[PDB]
Amino acid sequence: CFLAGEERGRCFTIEYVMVNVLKMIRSATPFPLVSLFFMFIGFILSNIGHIRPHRTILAFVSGIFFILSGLSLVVGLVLYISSINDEMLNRTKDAETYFNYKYGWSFAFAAISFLLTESAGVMSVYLFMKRYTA
Amino acid sequence: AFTFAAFCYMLTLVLCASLIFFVIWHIIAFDELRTDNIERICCLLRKLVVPEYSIHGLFCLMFLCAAEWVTLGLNIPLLFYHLWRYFHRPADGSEVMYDAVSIMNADILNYCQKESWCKLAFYLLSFFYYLYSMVYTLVS
Amino acid sequence: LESPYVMMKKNHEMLEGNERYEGYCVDLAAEIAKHCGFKYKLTIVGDGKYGARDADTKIWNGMVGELVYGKADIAIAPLTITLVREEVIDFSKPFMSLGISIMIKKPQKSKPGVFSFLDPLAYEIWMCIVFAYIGVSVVLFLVSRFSPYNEFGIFNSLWFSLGAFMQQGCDISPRSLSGRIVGGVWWFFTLIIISSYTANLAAFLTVERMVSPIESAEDLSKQTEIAYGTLDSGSTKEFFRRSKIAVFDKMWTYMRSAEPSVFVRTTAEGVARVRKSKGKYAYLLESTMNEYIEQRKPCDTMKVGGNLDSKGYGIATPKGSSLGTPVNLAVLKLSEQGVLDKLKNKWWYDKGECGAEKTSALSLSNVAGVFYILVGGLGLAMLVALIEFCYK
Amino acid sequence: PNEFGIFNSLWFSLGAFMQQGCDISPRSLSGRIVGGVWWFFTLIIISSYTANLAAFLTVERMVSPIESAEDLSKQTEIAYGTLDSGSTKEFFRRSKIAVFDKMWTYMRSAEPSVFVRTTAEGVARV
Amino acid sequence: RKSKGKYAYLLESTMNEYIEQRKPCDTMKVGGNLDSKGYGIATPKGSSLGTPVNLAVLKLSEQGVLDKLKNKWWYDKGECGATSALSLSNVAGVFYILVGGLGLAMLVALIEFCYKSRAGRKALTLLSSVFAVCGLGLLGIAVSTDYWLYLEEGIILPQNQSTEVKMSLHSGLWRV
Amino acid sequence: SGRIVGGVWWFFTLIIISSYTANLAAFLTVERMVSPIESAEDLSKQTEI
Amino acid sequence: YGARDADTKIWNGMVGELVYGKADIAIAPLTITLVREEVIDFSKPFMSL
Ligand SMILES: CC(C)CCC[C@@H](C)[C@H]1CC[C@H]2[C@@H]3CC=C4C[C@@H](O)CC[C@]4(C)[C@@H]3CC[C@@]12C
Ligand SMILES: CC(C)CCC[C@@H](C)[C@H]1CC[C@H]2[C@@H]3CC=C4C[C@@H](O)CC[C@]4(C)[C@@H]3CC[C@@]12C
Ligand SMILES: CC(C)CCC[C@@H](C)[C@H]1CC[C@H]2[C@@H]3CC=C4C[C@@H](O)CC[C@]4(C)[C@@H]3CC[C@@]12C
Ligand SMILES: CC(C)CCC[C@@H](C)[C@H]1CC[C@H]2[C@@H]3CC=C4C[C@@H](O)CC[C@]4(C)[C@@H]3CC[C@]12C
Ligand SMILES: N#Cc1ccccc1-c1cc(-c2ccccn2)cn(-c2ccccc2)c1=O
Ligand SMILES: O=c1[nH]c2cc(C(F)(F)F)c(N3CCOCC3)cc2n(CP(=O)(O)O)c1=O
Ligand SMILES: O=c1[nH]c2cc(C(F)(F)F)c(N3CCOCC3)cc2n(CP(=O)(O)O)c1=O
Ligand code: NA
C-alpha cells in the first residue's frame, strides 16, 4: 500500500505488481505462518489438557508447540530484517538522495508475540510438573 | 609450508604413540596371563580397547576431511577389521565385550596373541608412515 | 556527432559557425589549422556513418565517402586507421591509440553470506581448530584415565575443551601434572586464536577494500558466471569472429551460442545492461568510450585490464591532397608537445563528472548466520532430549 | 536425570553472554548443546562489538581537517568556491601554480555553481 | 632488484614487459603508459616501397599477425609464469606448541604411571644451598662485569647494504 | 593477603591481554591500508619510493 | 637508432643509413618521431607503446 509519493490508494498485492526487497520479504514469509500454526496447535492442545486432565501429557506437548513457535519467529524476524539490510546495501550509492526504512506496529506485534508464547511455553511446562507430581 | 593436511599428520604421530602403548601393554597382559587371573585380565583389558578404536576412528574422519585418500585407504584394512570385532564377533560378553568373560579354553588365546603382534607391526609402520608424510607435506 | 569529439555546445541556438560545436575534435581542428595555416568550416557529416564501401553499389558512405567523392577536404574525427580506408584516402599518424577493453560494473560492499562470520580466519584455520579440539580432548582423556591423579571422561574432556575455547572458564579443572600441561597449552592456544579473530575483524571493518573479480580477458574466458558480450555489429564483433590467438576464440564460441543474447544493439543498451545486472555483465567496447562513460554520471561503471588489440584514430585527407603531408607533421608536433595528452585530460578527466568514511554499525546481515546456528542448535538440543527421554 | 529451572537458566545464559559465568554448568548432552551454541554465539557477538568499536575509533582518529589549499585540492568532497566577481575569482582564473590551477579546474566545472554572489551569501552557505 | 621495493624505474613499455618475463621474475609492470608513441617501418622518403609496406603493416595488424608475433617472443618464449583472511602460516607456531605440549604431557603420563606403580630434610638442605651459592655467583659475576648492553650506531650505504660501524660498544653498569 | 596478589595479577593480565589484541589489530589494519603503486600519480604523491 | 648531431647536421644510425642511401628499409623498433618523419617515411605503427 502506497502513500504520498504517487499517492495511489490501491493496496497492491505482491504478485500482481511486477523493488527487489519485495521479493526478499517473500523468503521470510513462511516462518510467521509456521509460528501462527504452532500457536494454534499448542492452544487447542492446552484446552484439551484443561478439560481432560486424566492424561497429563497434553500440557507438556502443548508447551513444546509454544516454544517451537517462538523459535520460528526469531528465524523469521532475522530473515525479515536481514533481507531489508541486504537490499539497502545493493543500491547505487549517491549522496544527492536519501533512503529510509522503518518498522511499524505489525512488526512490533510479531515481536511482542514472541514474548507471550515463550511465557506460555514455560508456564505450560511448569503446569505439567504440577500435574505429574500430584 | 604448514597446512591443514600437514597438521593432520602431526596430530596422528601424537596419537599413534598412544596406540603403540596400548599394544605393548596388550602383549604383556597375555604373557602375564599364561604365567599365573581371569577376572582381573578380563577387567584390565576391557577398559583399554574402546580408546584404541575411536582414536583410529578419529584418523578415518581426520584424513577424510584432509583429502588424504592414500592415507585414508591405508587405514581402511585396520578399520574394517575393527568393525568385525564389535558388530559381529564381540562374543556375547555384555559388559563392554571382547577380551572379557571368554578366556581359557585356549583357542582365542592363540588368536589374541597373533593379533597382538599384528597390531604392533601395523602401528610401528603407521608411525613412520605418518612421520614421513609429515616431513613430506611440510617441505613440499 | 560523438562525445567528447564533437558535442553541440549548450546555447548553440544563438551561435553560428565553428563555435556552435565543442569537444576534442573541435579543439584538435583548431590546433591543426594554426600549424598548417588555413581557415576551416566545421561540418557535421550527413549519413552519420564513419565510412564503409557498399557491398553491391561500391559507394563509400560517411566521412570517408565525403573525402573520396569530393564533398570534403579533411576529416578531423575519431576515424579508425584501417586497411580498406587507407586504399582510398590518406591517414596521418594516430593522434589517439586505443583498443577493445572491458566494461564492468564498479564493485560494491558485497552483501554477506551465512558463514561470513567465519571469514576473519581462513577455512584452513577453522578445520585445524576443530581437529585440535578433538585432539586435546582425546589427550585429556588418555592422560586422566590412565595414570590417574577421573572426573575427566571423554565427554567431560570435550566439555572442558569446548569451554576453554569459548573462554567460559570451567566447572572442573585437571589436578595432575600431565592434565595441566594439556589444559594449560590449550588455554594459550585459545588466547592467540580469539585475539587474532578480533584483531583481524577490526582490520576488515576499519579498511574497506573492494576487489574486482575480473582484471583481464583471460579471467573472463575462465568463467561462465559473468556473461560478456559485444555490440551486435561493428569492429568489436568482427574482431572476436576472425580471431585466432588462443583466448578470443574461446570468448567467441561463448558469445555466439549463449542464451539470452549477449550482443546488445546499441552502446547505451550495453552500458545499461552493465549497470542493471549487479556485476554479471561485462561489456566489450573501445577503450575511449569506456574511459568516458567511467567519468560520466553515475560512477557505476569501471574499465578493467589492458586493451585487447591496438588500433588508432587518424586524420584523413583525400588521396592526393596538399594537406596530407603538413597535417601528418602537425599531429607529430602535437603529440610530442603534449597537446594531444592535454586535450584528452581536459575532455575525459577535467570535465569528468565522477571525481578523483564514518564507520557504520554492524547490520544483522553480517552476523545473521550465528543466529541460524543458534536456533539450529536449540532445535538440535530438543531432539537429543527426546531421544534421551525415549532411550531412558 | 533440578538445578536448571527457569530462573537459574536465565542466569546461566546471562553469565554466558557477559563471559562471567561461574554457577552450575549443564551435565546432560542435550543441555550441553544449548550451552555450547550459546557460548559460540557470544564469542562472535562480543568480538564483533569490540572490533566494530575499534573500527569506529580508528576512522574517527584518521580524520584530517582542512588546513591548506592542497588539502582542498585533494579532498574533492568538501565543495569550495569564491565570489562571482573580483580579485579572488580572477586569481584562480589567471593562476599557473599547480594547486591553484587544480582548484580552478574544480570550480569552473561544478554543479551546482559554487560561486556565491555576495560575501554575506558565502558566509551563509558555510 | 637490489632496493627491496624502494626504487621504481621509468622505461619503455615493451622492455618493461620483456624483462618481466625473463628470469629472475623480480619485476612487474604497473599502471598504464604515460605517453603514446609507436614503432614504424621506415623507408628513404622517396622509395617505391613505402606504400606497399604501409599496406602490409595494416594487413598484418588486422589479421592478428603482429599480436601473434608479440606473444611468441614476449610470452611464449618467456621464462616466468602466466584473500584478506588470516592464514595458517601466521599462526603456525601456536599449533607447534600445542602438538609439542600434548606430546610432552603424554611423556609425563608415562613417568607418573611408572612412578605411581613402583611406589626429606636432607634434600632441601642440599638444594637451597647450591641454588643460593650459584644465585650469589651468577648475580655477583653479572654486576661486576661489563657485558650488559651491546650497542651499535653505524650507517648504511645504498650499495648492496654496505655497513660501516662508527660507535660499536659493549657496556655494563659501571663500564662503557 | 592472598587476594591482593590475586587482584594485582588479575589487573596485570587485563592490560597485557588487551595490549596484545590491540597491537595485533593495529598491525593487521596498517597491513591492510597498504596501497601499492599503480599509477604515476601514486609515484608523484608517495615521495618515499 | 637515429639522431641529428646539431653541429654537423648529419644523422647517425638507422635513420642515417636510410637518408644516405645505404639502406632500403629499416624493420626495427624505430620510434615515429617528428624530426625523423621529415627525412624518412614511416609506416603505420606495428607496435604501440
Ligand atoms: C545428529 C542428529 C541427526 C541426531 C543425533 C542424536 C542421537 C542419534 C545421538 C546423539 C548422541 C547419543 C546419546 C547417547 C548418551 C546419552 C546418554 C543416554 O543416557 C541417553 C541418551 C544420550 C543423551 C544420547 C542419545 C542420542 C544419541 C544416541
Ligand atoms: C610430539 C611430536 C612427535 C609431534 C611432532 C613434533 C613437532 C611439534 C616439532 C618437531 C620439530 C619441529 C620442526 C622445526 C623446523 C622446522 C622448521 C619450522 O620453520 C617449521 C616447522 C619445522 C618444519 C618443524 C615443525 C615440527 C616441529 C615444531
Ligand atoms: C620432563 C620430565 C622430567 C618432567 C616430569 C616430572 C616428573 C618426572 C616427576 C617430577 C617428580 C615427581 C612428583 C613428585 C611428588 C609427587 C608426589 C608423588 O606422590 C607422586 C607424584 C608427585 C605428584 C610428582 C609426579 C612427577 C614426578 C614423578
Ligand atoms: C529444528 C529447527 C529449529 C532447526 C532447523 C529449522 C529452521 C528453523 C532454520 C534454522 C536455520 C535456517 C536456514 C538459514 C539459511 C538459509 C538461508 C536463508 O536465505 C533462508 C533460509 C535458509 C535456507 C535456512 C532456512 C531454515 C532454517 C534451517
Ligand atoms: N562485517 C562483518 C563481520 C561481522 C562479524 C563477523 C564476521 C564479519 C565478517 C568478516 C570478514 C572478514 C574477512 C577477512 C578478514 C576479516 N574479516 C568478512 N565478512 C564479509 C562481509 C561481506 C561479505 C562476505 C564476508 C564479514 O562479514
Ligand atoms: O572508424 C570508426 N570509428 C569509430 C569510432 C567510435 C568512437 F569510439 F565513438 F569514436 C565508434 N563507437 C564506439 C562504440 O560504439 C559507438 C561509436 C565507432 C567507430 N567506428 C564504427 P566500428 O569500429 O565498426 O564499431 C568506426 O568505423
Ligand atoms: O581595492 C579593493 N579592496 C577591497 C577590500 C575588500 C575588503 F576586504 F572589504 F576590505 C573587499 N571585499 C572582500 C570581502 O568582501 C567585502 C569586500 C574588496 C576589495 N576590492 C574589490 P576585490 O578585491 O576585487 O574583491 C578592492 O578592489
Ligand atoms: Na583498528
Author numbering:
A (entry chain C): 890 to 907, 919 to 1034
B (entry chain E): 2 to 37, 56 to 159
C (entry chain D): 401 to 549, 569 to 775, 782 to 817
D (entry chain C): 548, 569 to 693
E (entry chain A): 694 to 775, 784 to 820, 833 to 889
F (entry chain A): 597 to 645
G (entry chain A): 450 to 498
Quote the study that presented this structure, word for word.
Synaptic complexes of α-amino-3-hydroxy-5-methyl-4-isoxazolepropionic acid (AMPA) receptors (AMPARs) with auxiliary subunits mediate most excitatory neurotransmission and can be targeted to treat neuropsychiatric and neurological disorders, including epilepsy. Here we present cryogenic-electron microscopy structures of rat GluA2 AMPAR complexes with inhibitory mouse γ5 and potentiating human cornichon-2 (CNIH2) auxiliary subunits. The core of each complex is a Y-shaped tetrameric AMPAR with a three-layer domain organization.
To gain insight into the structural mechanism of PMP inhibition in the presence of γ5 and CNIH2, we supplemented the purified protein with 100 µM ZK and 100 µM PMP and subjected it to cryo-EM. Data processing revealed two populations of particles. Reconstruction from the second population of particles revealed densities for two γ5 and two CNIH2 subunits around the GluA2 TMD, molecules of ZK bound to LBD clamshells, PMP at the extracellular collar and SPD in the channel selectivity filter. The resulting GluA2–γ5–CNIH2ZK-SPD-PMP structure is similar to GluA2–γ5ZK-PMP, except that the latter lacks two CNIH2 subunits and SPD. GluA2–γ5–CNIH2ZK-SPD-PMP showed apparent asymmetry of the intracellular portion of the channel pore, which has not been observed in AMPAR structures before. Cysteines C589 formed two pairs of disulfide bridges clearly detected in cryo-EM density, illustrating the twofold symmetry of the channel intracellular entrance. Crosslinking of C589 cysteines was not observed in the GluA2–γ5ZK-PMP structure or in the absence of PMP (GluA2–γ5–CNIH2ZK-SPD), indicating that CNIH2 and PMP together are the two factors that cause strong deviation of the AMPAR inner pore from the fourfold rotational symmetry, likely due to increased protein flexibility in this region. While CNIH2 is in close proximity to the selectivity filter-forming M2 and can influence M2 dynamics directly through a single lipid molecule that separates them, PMP is distal from the inner pore. Being in the ion channel extracellular collar, PMP can influence the selectivity filter dynamics allosterically, through the M1, M3 and M4 helices. Accordingly, increased selectivity filter dynamics can cause a reduction in PMP affinity to GluA2–γ5–CNIH2ZK-SPD-PMP.
